[PDB]
A paper describes a structure:
Proper operation of the pivotal CME cargo adaptor AP2 requires membrane-localized Fer/Cip4 homology domain-only proteins (FCHO). The AP2 complex, composed of α, β2, μ2, and σ2 subunits, is pivotal to mammalian CCV formation, and its deletion is embryonically lethal in mice. FCHO1 and FCHO2 are similar in overall domain arrangement —folded N-terminal acidic phospholipid-binding homodimerization F-BAR domains and C-terminal folded μ-homology domains (μHD) separated by a ~300-residue, low-complexity intrinsically disordered protein linker, which has been suggested to participate in AP2 activation, although how it does so is undetermined. We dissect the network of interactions between the FCHO interdomain linker and AP2, which concentrates, orients, tethers, and partially destabilizes closed AP2 at the plasma membrane.
Crystals of a complex of Cμ2 and a peptide corresponding to this WxxL signal were grown, diffracted to 1.7-Å resolution, and were solved by MR using 1.9-Å unliganded Cμ2 as a search model. Binding was dependent on the presence of the tryptophan side chain as the homologous sequence from FCHO1, which does not contain a tryptophan, showed no binding. The mode favored will likely be context dependent, and it will likely be affected by multiple spatial and temporal factors in a nascent CCP including how many other α-appendage binding CCV proteins are present and whether the YxxΦ site of Cμ2 is accessible and/or occupied by cargo. These binding modes are likely to be in dynamic equilibrium with each other. The absence of WxxL in the C block of neuronally enriched FCHO1 but its presence in the ubiquitously expressed FCHO2 may reflect the paucity of YxxΦ-containing cargo found in synaptic CCVs that could compete out WxxL from Cμ2, which, if it did not occur, could slow or stall CCV formation. Thus, C blocks of all muniscin family members can bind to the α-appendage platform in a manner that is competitive with the binding of FxDxF and DP[FW] motifs of accessory CME proteins, and in addition, the partially overlapping WxxL sequence found only in FCHO2 can bind to the Cμ2 YxxΦ cargo–binding site and therefore potentially stabilize the unclosed but not-yet-open form of AP2.
Author numbering:
A (entry chain AAA): 160 to 223, 239 to 377, 381 to 435
B (entry chain BBB): 107 to 116
Protein backbone atom coordinates (compact mmCIF):
# COMPACT_ATOMS: atom_id res chain seq x y z
CA UNK A 1 0.00 0.00 0.00
CA UNK A 2 2.95 2.42 0.76
CA UNK A 3 5.17 2.00 -2.30
CA UNK A 4 4.57 1.75 -6.11
CA UNK A 5 6.15 -1.13 -8.09
CA UNK A 6 8.96 -0.38 -10.58
CA UNK A 7 11.00 2.23 -8.57
CA UNK A 8 14.58 2.44 -9.92
CA UNK A 9 17.57 4.47 -8.70
CA UNK A 10 21.17 4.35 -10.07
CA UNK A 11 22.33 5.18 -6.47
CA UNK A 12 20.67 3.21 -3.59
CA UNK A 13 21.00 5.48 -0.54
CA UNK A 14 19.19 6.32 2.71
CA UNK A 15 19.35 8.95 5.45
CA UNK A 16 18.02 8.53 9.03
CA UNK A 17 17.34 11.70 11.06
CA UNK A 18 16.99 11.23 14.85
CA UNK A 19 15.22 14.40 16.06
CA UNK A 20 14.72 14.89 19.79
CA UNK A 21 13.37 17.59 22.10
CA UNK A 22 14.71 17.47 25.69
CA UNK A 23 12.58 19.01 28.45
CA UNK A 24 13.49 19.76 32.07
CA UNK A 25 12.16 21.45 35.20
CA UNK A 26 14.92 21.64 37.82
CA UNK A 27 14.53 22.90 41.44
CA UNK A 28 17.02 25.46 42.80
CA UNK A 29 18.49 22.54 44.92
CA UNK A 30 19.39 20.61 41.68
CA UNK A 31 16.39 18.22 42.03
CA UNK A 32 14.84 17.10 38.70
CA UNK A 33 11.13 17.92 39.14
CA UNK A 34 10.30 16.72 35.59
CA UNK A 35 12.15 15.68 32.47
CA UNK A 36 11.32 13.94 29.22
CA UNK A 37 12.47 13.48 25.65
CA UNK A 38 10.06 13.55 22.67
CA UNK A 39 11.72 11.87 19.69
CA UNK A 40 11.13 10.81 16.13
CA UNK A 41 13.07 8.99 13.44
CA UNK A 42 12.63 10.33 9.88
CA UNK A 43 13.81 8.07 7.06
CA UNK A 44 14.55 9.48 3.58
CA UNK A 45 15.43 6.75 1.07
CA UNK A 46 16.13 6.27 -2.66
CA UNK A 47 16.02 2.47 -2.81
CA UNK A 48 15.29 0.46 -6.01
CA UNK A 49 12.40 -2.04 -6.00
CA UNK A 50 10.59 -3.28 -2.86
CA UNK A 51 13.30 -3.40 -0.17
CA UNK A 52 12.66 -5.34 3.06
CA UNK A 53 14.17 -3.20 5.84
CA UNK A 54 15.00 -3.67 9.54
CA UNK A 55 15.78 -0.78 11.93
CA UNK A 56 17.98 -1.49 14.91
CA UNK A 57 18.60 0.73 17.89
CA UNK A 58 20.04 0.38 21.45
CA UNK A 59 16.64 -0.61 23.00
CA UNK A 60 17.24 -2.22 26.55
CA UNK A 61 14.88 -5.16 25.65
CA UNK A 62 17.21 -6.38 22.80
CA UNK A 63 20.53 -5.41 24.62
CA UNK A 64 19.90 -7.31 27.96
CA UNK A 65 24.66 1.64 26.75
CA UNK A 66 20.93 0.87 26.02
CA UNK A 67 17.73 2.98 26.54
CA UNK A 68 14.22 2.65 28.01
CA UNK A 69 11.47 3.68 25.56
CA UNK A 70 8.38 4.55 27.64
CA UNK A 71 6.00 4.56 24.64
CA UNK A 72 6.38 4.53 20.87
CA UNK A 73 4.35 4.31 17.70
CA UNK A 74 5.35 3.49 14.16
CA UNK A 75 4.44 4.28 10.58
CA UNK A 76 1.75 1.94 9.19
CA UNK A 77 4.50 0.18 7.09
CA UNK A 78 5.98 -1.41 10.31
CA UNK A 79 4.95 -5.01 11.19
CA UNK A 80 3.58 -4.51 14.74
CA UNK A 81 3.22 -8.31 15.29
CA UNK A 82 7.03 -8.69 14.96
CA UNK A 83 7.70 -5.67 17.25
CA UNK A 84 5.37 -7.26 19.91
CA UNK A 85 6.79 -10.84 19.43
CA UNK A 86 10.59 -10.11 18.74
CA UNK A 87 11.10 -6.33 19.39
CA UNK A 88 12.14 -6.23 15.72
CA UNK A 89 11.26 -3.17 13.54
CA UNK A 90 10.58 -4.61 10.04
CA UNK A 91 9.00 -2.78 7.04
CA UNK A 92 8.96 -2.05 3.33
CA UNK A 93 9.27 1.76 3.42
CA UNK A 94 7.51 4.41 1.40
CA UNK A 95 9.76 6.00 -1.22
CA UNK A 96 11.30 9.40 -0.30
CA UNK A 97 10.73 10.85 3.19
CA UNK A 98 8.51 9.48 5.99
CA UNK A 99 8.33 9.36 9.81
CA UNK A 100 9.30 5.81 10.80
CA UNK A 101 8.81 6.06 14.60
CA UNK A 102 7.88 8.51 17.37
CA UNK A 103 8.80 7.87 20.99
CA UNK A 104 8.99 9.31 24.51
CA UNK A 105 11.56 8.65 27.27
CA UNK A 106 11.86 9.79 30.90
CA UNK A 107 14.69 7.56 32.33
CA UNK A 108 18.48 8.10 32.21
CA UNK A 109 18.14 11.24 30.03
CA UNK A 110 21.39 13.08 29.18
CA UNK A 111 20.63 16.63 30.39
CA UNK A 112 23.07 18.39 28.05
CA UNK A 113 23.46 21.51 30.25
CA UNK A 114 23.56 21.99 34.03
CA UNK A 115 22.45 25.49 35.08
CA UNK A 116 23.81 26.66 38.47
CA UNK A 117 22.23 29.97 39.58
CA UNK A 118 23.33 32.21 42.51
CA UNK A 119 21.10 35.10 43.56
CA UNK A 120 22.13 37.56 46.35
CA UNK A 121 19.44 40.11 47.46
CA UNK A 122 21.68 43.03 48.67
CA UNK A 123 19.82 45.80 50.59
CA UNK A 124 16.39 46.36 48.97
CA UNK A 125 17.91 48.19 45.88
CA UNK A 126 20.40 45.58 44.47
CA UNK A 127 20.30 41.98 43.13
CA UNK A 128 23.46 40.03 42.24
CA UNK A 129 22.62 37.22 39.79
CA UNK A 130 25.28 34.77 38.64
CA UNK A 131 24.75 31.70 36.49
CA UNK A 132 27.20 28.96 35.62
CA UNK A 133 26.41 26.61 32.72
CA UNK A 134 28.21 23.29 32.29
CA UNK A 135 28.12 21.22 29.08
CA UNK A 136 27.52 17.57 30.09
CA UNK A 137 28.53 15.60 26.95
CA UNK A 138 31.65 14.39 25.10
CA UNK A 139 34.40 17.01 24.58
CA UNK A 140 34.47 16.17 20.81
CA UNK A 141 30.83 17.43 20.35
CA UNK A 142 29.78 21.11 20.00
CA UNK A 143 26.47 22.50 21.20
CA UNK A 144 25.26 25.44 19.13
CA UNK A 145 22.63 28.23 19.24
CA UNK A 146 22.94 28.46 23.04
CA UNK A 147 20.66 31.02 24.76
CA UNK A 148 20.26 31.49 28.55
CA UNK A 149 17.30 33.72 29.56
CA UNK A 150 17.51 35.17 33.11
CA UNK A 151 14.34 36.94 34.26
CA UNK A 152 14.58 40.43 35.81
CA UNK A 153 12.18 42.13 38.25
CA UNK A 154 9.53 44.60 37.01
CA UNK A 155 11.15 47.32 39.27
CA UNK A 156 14.59 46.99 37.53
CA UNK A 157 16.33 50.41 37.39
CA UNK A 158 19.43 49.27 35.46
CA UNK A 159 21.61 46.22 34.71
CA UNK A 160 25.34 45.79 34.43
CA UNK A 161 26.30 42.37 33.06
CA UNK A 162 29.42 40.57 31.78
CA UNK A 163 30.01 36.97 30.77
CA UNK A 164 33.06 34.71 30.27
CA UNK A 165 32.00 33.53 26.76
CA UNK A 166 29.47 34.86 24.24
CA UNK A 167 27.42 38.07 24.64
CA UNK A 168 24.73 39.16 27.07
CA UNK A 169 22.16 41.94 26.94
CA UNK A 170 19.42 43.25 29.26
CA UNK A 171 16.15 43.40 27.24
CA UNK A 172 13.83 45.63 29.32
CA UNK A 173 10.94 44.91 26.86
CA UNK A 174 11.26 41.19 27.80
CA UNK A 175 12.21 41.65 31.51
CA UNK A 176 15.20 39.37 30.85
CA UNK A 177 18.93 39.19 30.49
CA UNK A 178 19.64 37.23 27.30
CA UNK A 179 23.02 35.42 27.06
CA UNK A 180 23.96 33.95 23.66
CA UNK A 181 26.86 31.58 22.93
CA UNK A 182 27.43 30.45 19.31
CA UNK A 183 29.28 27.19 20.12
CA UNK A 184 30.39 25.27 23.21
CA UNK A 185 32.22 21.93 23.38
CA UNK A 186 31.40 19.23 25.93
CA UNK A 187 32.89 19.20 29.45
CA UNK A 188 33.20 22.99 29.44
CA UNK A 189 31.76 25.71 31.67
CA UNK A 190 31.03 29.41 31.49
CA UNK A 191 29.60 32.12 33.71
CA UNK A 192 27.50 35.29 33.60
CA UNK A 193 27.39 37.90 36.37
CA UNK A 194 24.77 40.67 36.57
CA UNK A 195 24.25 43.52 39.05
CA UNK A 196 20.55 44.60 38.95
CA UNK A 197 19.81 48.05 40.47
CA UNK A 198 16.19 48.07 41.81
CA UNK A 199 13.76 51.01 42.24
CA UNK A 200 12.94 51.35 45.97
CA UNK A 201 9.30 50.36 46.83
CA UNK A 202 7.44 49.94 50.20
CA UNK A 203 7.21 46.30 51.56
CA UNK A 204 11.28 38.84 44.41
CA UNK A 205 8.86 36.34 42.62
CA UNK A 206 11.37 34.65 40.23
CA UNK A 207 10.43 32.83 37.02
CA UNK A 208 12.88 30.08 36.07
CA UNK A 209 16.07 30.50 34.00
CA UNK A 210 15.39 28.96 30.58
CA UNK A 211 17.80 27.67 27.93
CA UNK A 212 17.72 27.11 24.22
CA UNK A 213 20.35 24.90 22.55
CA UNK A 214 21.00 22.36 19.80
CA UNK A 215 23.28 19.33 20.36
CA UNK A 216 24.52 16.78 17.82
CA UNK A 217 23.32 13.72 19.82
CA UNK A 218 20.08 12.17 21.18
CA UNK A 219 19.61 13.22 24.83
CA UNK A 220 17.44 10.06 25.19
CA UNK A 221 20.67 8.05 24.67
CA UNK A 222 19.24 6.56 21.43
CA UNK A 223 21.86 5.18 19.02
CA UNK A 224 21.02 3.72 15.61
CA UNK A 225 22.75 0.32 15.38
CA UNK A 226 21.70 -0.73 11.82
CA UNK A 227 19.32 -0.33 8.88
CA UNK A 228 19.38 -3.75 7.11
CA UNK A 229 18.14 -3.79 3.50
CA UNK A 230 17.28 -6.85 1.34
CA UNK A 231 15.66 -6.64 -2.15
CA UNK A 232 15.00 -10.29 -3.22
CA UNK A 233 14.26 -9.76 -6.99
CA UNK A 234 17.04 -7.18 -7.62
CA UNK A 235 19.27 -9.15 -5.15
CA UNK A 236 21.04 -6.12 -3.49
CA UNK A 237 21.83 -5.96 0.27
CA UNK A 238 23.32 -3.58 2.84
CA UNK A 239 26.74 -3.61 1.20
CA UNK A 240 25.15 -2.12 -1.97
CA UNK A 241 23.38 0.74 -0.03
CA UNK A 242 24.95 4.01 1.10
CA UNK A 243 23.59 4.76 4.60
CA UNK A 244 23.76 7.92 6.75
CA UNK A 245 22.48 8.93 10.23
CA UNK A 246 22.21 12.39 11.83
CA UNK A 247 21.26 13.22 15.43
CA UNK A 248 19.73 16.61 16.32
CA UNK A 249 18.83 17.20 19.99
CA UNK A 250 17.05 20.48 20.72
CA UNK A 251 15.85 22.07 23.96
CA UNK A 252 12.08 22.11 24.45
CA UNK A 253 11.07 23.71 27.78
CA UNK A 254 14.39 23.54 29.66
CA UNK A 255 13.94 25.42 32.94
CA UNK A 256 16.02 25.76 36.12
CA UNK A 257 14.36 27.52 39.06
CA UNK A 258 16.56 30.02 40.99
CA UNK B 1 26.23 21.17 7.74
CA UNK B 2 27.15 17.91 6.06
CA UNK B 3 29.67 17.07 8.85
CA UNK B 4 26.60 16.17 11.01
CA UNK B 5 25.96 13.06 8.79
CA UNK B 6 27.64 9.90 10.07
CA UNK B 7 28.02 6.76 8.04
CA UNK B 8 26.16 3.61 9.02
CA UNK B 9 28.47 0.64 8.28
CA UNK B 10 27.38 -3.04 8.57
Amino acid sequence: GWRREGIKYRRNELFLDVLESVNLLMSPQGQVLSAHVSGRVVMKSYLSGMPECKFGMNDKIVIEQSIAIDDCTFHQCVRLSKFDSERSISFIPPDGEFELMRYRTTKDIILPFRVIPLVREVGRTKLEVKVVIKSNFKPSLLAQKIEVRIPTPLNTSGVQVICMKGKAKYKASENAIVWKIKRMAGMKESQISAEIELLPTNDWARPPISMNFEVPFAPSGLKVRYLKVFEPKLNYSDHDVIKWVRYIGRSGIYETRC
Amino acid sequence: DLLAWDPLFG
